[PDB]
């Protein structure tokens, strides 16, 4: 077996049926314009070299066999400092079916880049993307696919949401091509549609602002002859407004 050559080299195009099971949709960092997501990134592909016939039909093995055989060099186009978990052992599974099909699942914590247009912040919704594909192999050599229907190929665990100020409405997937001077590369994209929960900002900036303006309008009921009281009423409210604005900008990049 040669680890350096893809299956069916020179005769076929290696089709990899990928799939994502979102174990937990991690917190969204608006400051870094990125989001964390822990997944069971599964890939499946046919390799005629790894065809056997024995007492068992499927060989469930560990990562040691995964390192010994060819696996797709899938990388996330907008990934930023992802980690493949290693405790206790490399969190990977390899399963060689007797026909030659491989099922290679890995547990990942991918910190993908999500460019956000914060024009309507905090009443804003963002379609955070997750695009992945082969790095070294062009569309003529490695093509990706969804193992199930595209709608049913990115499953999110029910009690997995780690979002604090966001609501995962859903996800939508697609497949496309990236043009490059190096070549044409097949890309699998999935957009997670998040909607920011305004609850925190209502009681952190909106309520203080409304109470401050009502406090300033309280001065219209004080007698005009009380100059120090209404003067401090006004100046303290304006200074509070400046502090509120400055402390509201720091919540965003």
């Amino acid at each position: 077996y040669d680890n350096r050559l893809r299956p069916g080299l020179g005769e076929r195009v290696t089709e990899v049926k990928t799939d994502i099971f979102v174990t937990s949709f991690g917190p969204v960092s608006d400051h870094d314009m990125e989001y964390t997501i822990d997944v069971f990134f599964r890939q499946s592909w046919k390799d005629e070299r790894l065809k056997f016939k024995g007492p068992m039909t499927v060989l469930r093995l560990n990562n040691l066999m995964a390192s010994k055989i060819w696996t797709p060099d899938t990388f996330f186009h907008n990934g930023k400092k992802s980690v493949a978990h290693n405790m206790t052992m490399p969190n990977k599974l390899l399963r060689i079916t007797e026909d030659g099909t491989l099922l290679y699942t890995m547990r990942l914590t991918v910190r993908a880049e999500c460019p956000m247009h914060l024009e309507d912040f905090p009443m804003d919704a963002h379609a955070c993307p997750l695009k992945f594909g082969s790095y070294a192999y062009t569309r003529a050599e490695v093509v990706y696919e969804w193992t199930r229907e595209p709608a049913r190929s990115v499953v999110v665990a029910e009690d997995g949401s780690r979002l604090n100020q966001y609501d995962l409405l859903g996800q939508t997937v697609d497949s496309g091509i990236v043009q490059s001077s190096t070549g044409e590369y097949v890309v699998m994209t999935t957009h997670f549609h998040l909607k920011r929960k305004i609850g925190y900002f209502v009681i952190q900036t909106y309520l203080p602002c409304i109470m401050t303006v009502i406090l300033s309008q309280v001065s219209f009921w004080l007698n005009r002859e009380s100059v120090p009281a209404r003067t401090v009423f006004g100046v303290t409210t304006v200074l509070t407004m400046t502090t509120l604005s400055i402390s509201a900008r720091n919540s965003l990049p």
Partner: antibody
Amino acid sequence: EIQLQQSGPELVKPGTSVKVSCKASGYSFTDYNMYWVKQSHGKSLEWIGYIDPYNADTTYNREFKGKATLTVDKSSSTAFMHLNSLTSEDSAVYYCARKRNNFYFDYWGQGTPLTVS
Amino acid sequence: YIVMTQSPKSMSMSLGERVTLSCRASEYVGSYVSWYQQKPEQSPKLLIYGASNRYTGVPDRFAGSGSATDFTLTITSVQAEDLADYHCGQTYNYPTFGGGTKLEI
């Protein structure tokens, strides 16, 4: 090349089950799912269900859930659809389609007209 | 499921002119919207896969287009062989098909 040959047309009384075959020869049978589509005369194509031949894993439409049963013979490389409790509306033309990938159905079946009276 | 709507139920156009057949998807379908050609008493034939990708063996006059829910199949010059029933189907979710546009003269 790829050729999907289906069983010839037949007529059956209402309430009597019937099976329709789909033989593939060009490609390796277990690599791609086999879908079944019903088309009544003058109406839109309707999806019944599909079978993953390697493990025989089946998924059915809600309307045809229980009306149709999908089976497979890997050795003969044939996909079988079994319709039971046939009614008047079940008379239609049935095709078997081969789904190359998530995008398109590559090769369709020739067509098995079904009539009840 | 996703319901596909074919706006032109039956289009009547002469030979050698541009014709566009529309297709609407109820929900998001991405680029998983294929077009099929079905002559009378014949099985469907795939013409356009993806959203605009032309299937092999298809004349260059056929051209698909569409991003999310609006999809169009355009014939630059209708030939005598281009008179058949045209269906649009989505494979993003469980497969469904539209009513089927028929081309006439």
